[PDB]
Amino acid sequence: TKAGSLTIVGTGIESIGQMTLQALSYIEAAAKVFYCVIDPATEAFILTKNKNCVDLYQYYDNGKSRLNTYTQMSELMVREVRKGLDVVGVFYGHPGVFVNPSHRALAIAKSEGYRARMLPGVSAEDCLFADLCIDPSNPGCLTYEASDFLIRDRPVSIHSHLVLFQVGCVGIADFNFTGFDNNKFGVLVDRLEQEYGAEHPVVHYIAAMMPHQDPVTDKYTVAQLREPEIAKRVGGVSTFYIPPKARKASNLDIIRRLELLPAGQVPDKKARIYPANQWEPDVPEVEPYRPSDQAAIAQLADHAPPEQYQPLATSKAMSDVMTKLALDPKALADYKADHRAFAQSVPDLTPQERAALELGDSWAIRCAMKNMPSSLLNGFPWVIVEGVIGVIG
Amino acid sequence: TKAGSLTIVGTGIESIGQMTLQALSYIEAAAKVFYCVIDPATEAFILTKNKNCVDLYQYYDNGKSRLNTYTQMSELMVREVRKGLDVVGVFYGHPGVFVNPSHRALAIAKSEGYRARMLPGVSAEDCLFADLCIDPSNPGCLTYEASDFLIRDRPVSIHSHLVLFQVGCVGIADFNFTGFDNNKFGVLVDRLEQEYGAEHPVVHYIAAMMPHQDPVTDKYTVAQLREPEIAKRVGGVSTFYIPPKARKASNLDIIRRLELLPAGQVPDKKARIYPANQWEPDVPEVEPYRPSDQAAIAQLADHAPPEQYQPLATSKAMSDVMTKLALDPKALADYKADHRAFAQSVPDLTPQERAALELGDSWAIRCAMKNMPSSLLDPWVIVEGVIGVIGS
Ligand SMILES: Nc1ncnc2c1ncn2[C@@H]1O[C@H](CSCC[C@H](N)C(=O)O)[C@@H](O)[C@H]1O
Numbered sequence A: 001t002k003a004g005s006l007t008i009v010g011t012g013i014e015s016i017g018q019m020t021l022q023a024l025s026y027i028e029a030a031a032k033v034f035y036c037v038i039d040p041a042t043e044a045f046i047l048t049k050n051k052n053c054v055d056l057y058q059y060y061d062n063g064k065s066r067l068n069t070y071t072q073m074s075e076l077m078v079r080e081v082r083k084g085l086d087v088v089g090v091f092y093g094h095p096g097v098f099v100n101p102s103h104r105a106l107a108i109a110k111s112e113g114y115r116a117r118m119l120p121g122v123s124a125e126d127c128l129f130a131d132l133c134i135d136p137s138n139p140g141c142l143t144y145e146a147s148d149f150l151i152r153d154r155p156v157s158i159h160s161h162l163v164l165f166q167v168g169c170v171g172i173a174d175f176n177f178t179g180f181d182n183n184k185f186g187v188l189v190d191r192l193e194q195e196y197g198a199e200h201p202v203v204h205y206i207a208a209m210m211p212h213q214d215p216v217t218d219k220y221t222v223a224q225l226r227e228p229e230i231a232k233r234v235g236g237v238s239t240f241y242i243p244p245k246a247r248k249a250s251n252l253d254i255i256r257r258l259e260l261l262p263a264g265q266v267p268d269k270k271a272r273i274y275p276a277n278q279w280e281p282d283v284p285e286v287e288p289y290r291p292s293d294q295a296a297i298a299q300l301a302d303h304a305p306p307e308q309y310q311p312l313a314t315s316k317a318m319s320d321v322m323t324k325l326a327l328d329p330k331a332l333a334d335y336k337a338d339h340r341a342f343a344q345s346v347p348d349l350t351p352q353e354r355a356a357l358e359l360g361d362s363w364a365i366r367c368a369m370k371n372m373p374s375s376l377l378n379g380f381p382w383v384i385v386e387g388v389i390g391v392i393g
Numbered sequence B: 001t002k003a004g005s006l007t008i009v010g011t012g013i014e015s016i017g018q019m020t021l022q023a024l025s026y027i028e029a030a031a032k033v034f035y036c037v038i039d040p041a042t043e044a045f046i047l048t049k050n051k052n053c054v055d056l057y058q059y060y061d062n063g064k065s066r067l068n069t070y071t072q073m074s075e076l077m078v079r080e081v082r083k084g085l086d087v088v089g090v091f092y093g094h095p096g097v098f099v100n101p102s103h104r105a106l107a108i109a110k111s112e113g114y115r116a117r118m119l120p121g122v123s124a125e126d127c128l129f130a131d132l133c134i135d136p137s138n139p140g141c142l143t144y145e146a147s148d149f150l151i152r153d154r155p156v157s158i159h160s161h162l163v164l165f166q167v168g169c170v171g172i173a174d175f176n177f178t179g180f181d182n183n184k185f186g187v188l189v190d191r192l193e194q195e196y197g198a199e200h201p202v203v204h205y206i207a208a209m210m211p212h213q214d215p216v217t218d219k220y221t222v223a224q225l226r227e228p229e230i231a232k233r234v235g236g237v238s239t240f241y242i243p244p245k246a247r248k249a250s251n252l253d254i255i256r257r258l259e260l261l262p263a264g265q266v267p268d269k270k271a272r273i274y275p276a277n278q279w280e281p282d283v284p285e286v287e288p289y290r291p292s293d294q295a296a297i298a299q300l301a302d303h304a305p306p307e308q309y310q311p312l313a314t315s316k317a318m319s320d321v322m323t324k325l326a327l328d329p330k331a332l333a334d335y336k337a338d339h340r341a342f343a344q345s346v347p348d349l350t351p352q353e354r355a356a357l358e359l360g361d362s363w364a365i366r367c368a369m370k371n372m373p374s375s376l377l378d379p380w381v382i383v384e385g386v387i388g389v390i391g392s
């Protein structure tokens, strides 16, 4: 009902390319854009997309409490919302991951009755999984802010992934344009030594911020983080990844209750699905082509789509409108305001395509765009299986 | 050196719009595209961008081990890599987050000496943070596969976020086109009851997969997950978010070693930065405009950029080439092959812009594109988070 909206979007980490299509489309549609980005190529890119941009980075200052900066950044965005403008806030990475002012501005906007939405983006942790070739699923992931990790004595699991953000500003509440003397870094290393031992690997991770750069994926021992030459390499964009030290055994009660029953058949806790985490100390070599793998590959020769497989069967007109709804926020708002009026003005839709848009139901749109076989009559693509379940079945 | 490459990219969760610009650019540049997506609008979008696409979803079947499907998906991609083609694999969300065949195909390609890269994408957990309006930083985040959670008895922290994926197929190794009777769901609820109590909230989260849909953000008690009508709502795209039950106290030793020293000034462990996590039980209302907030806002009237602030000062030619390097993988490969030849063929660059590209160094490119004031010269600095005890 109320005039004025706040949409907060991300740029991702790597310059320009890690922005989502929808983030770009909201930046272009905005009446005003407020941005806080790392790299000048992303900044320049944003300014080519909207004529009314404000750099939020100017509200940092030497010795200025970051909390005061964040209150100011939030208020600049919400002031424009209250004047009835469609406002877009733009932050580095995912705009909600280790970001104070986005959450603050969205909560204020929401509480005063304005439309308020955060669109997800690619985080430094998303980059970490991709560059270190690890899956948070295998074997679970603990993610902490490094100072919070220490002050609140957050628990570590030696059996799961550990990721630490803001390791380059331990205990630091303020800002400095030339970066920080991270003098309390030794307090973090002491905790890592207690939890994992002095010989356990820590990966210094820096995602490439420009398209031509390589990531930093430097493995050090906990002990090596005490060498002054190495400690000095940790900066404001540094993240730590600590791999598991050991593998956790199966709970026989759960094995029974999940009927993975022939107990002898459950893989040894040391048995891995290819590939193994290469960062783990004493990483055993895992066979990519076991007899089960070779037999599955042998079946490819005679493979045909199962009877229940639903081939795409759509039209340019339907693909075009579904693309427009994703990439044109004004078209989306019009559609959400009046499904029927919008659907009836789309040129070249089949009667089924028109009907499907009029309803808006997932099922109607899926039947309109996929041939549903008689054999078949939500989505079900699971692309991971836990090893003990997989190897048994 | 070797002909043939594997790039694995994501589509994000919400149809089309949550694909990154670089994922799209690799899908367009590929010799062959293998995709596994949820929604037909994303599938149709991909097929308009490349003429040589294969749907990997056809390798699932009723009663067929998902592990066998994943071996087949991986091998289809690596076979094309081995024949010297630039292959792009496309998976929904982040292609490395709860995805077996991406990691497998990349490891095989890498081990046989081919170029192999995963590009990050927007995960269901990225969507969860955005839609539930929570920050994994406040107060830390534990992320598990629901079956792994149970079988390996993974630890919970009652003080931090808990996220559980694949809650709709507990203990299930196979596939069914019509979905599953999630009959072992009650085993997960038993564990959540032990760890948090029967009254503690669990958020049933489903990200909107189409641009017009609303997310499902339904809060239930652990006990309510036992009602058959509610348990039945949990499906293949369901994720659980379990909020913290309590707030963790500060370690006085670390307070001393980090010189947050005037101990009386450290906020009560109950004190929160606005806003509070709305999903927490007994969430105390937090004042958005404290006297400190009002004083910071009062300072906006007389605000000027600090002297050390670096205004953007670039050219169309330089912004164009930096955009081309991000959005044109063939232009990027050419640049990476020969900085100098590439830099010297870019039209309309200033001598500084040309020199900066020739070197490739971050600093050279930053000076070329930003006015660095004398005050600054006498590292990338962008910290958008501060925890409560430090900040106050
Ligand atoms: N290029 C990079 N490589 C690795 N970690 C990075 C990074 N840039 C930022 N980070 C991490 O993020 C912290 C800043 S908090 C801002 C995070 C951003 N919203 C995101 O989605 O990731 C840094 O201290 C570091 O831990």
Ligand SMILES: Nc1ncnc2c1ncn2[C@@H]1O[C@H](CSCC[C@H](N)C(=O)O)[C@@H](O)[C@H]1O
Residues within 6 Å of the ligand: A381, A382, A383, A384, B013, B091, B092, B093, B094, B095, B096, B097, B098, B099, B122, B123, B124, B125, B164, B165, B166, B167, B168, B205, B206, B207, B208, B209, B236, B237, B238, B239, B240
């Ligand atoms: N629309 C959606 N909303 C919430 N969770 C979802 C989802 N789609 C998938 N998921 C989660 O992802 C699991 C499949 S595993 C694949 C995850 C995907 N690679 C990603 O990046 O998120 C599901 O069981 C569920 O836990």
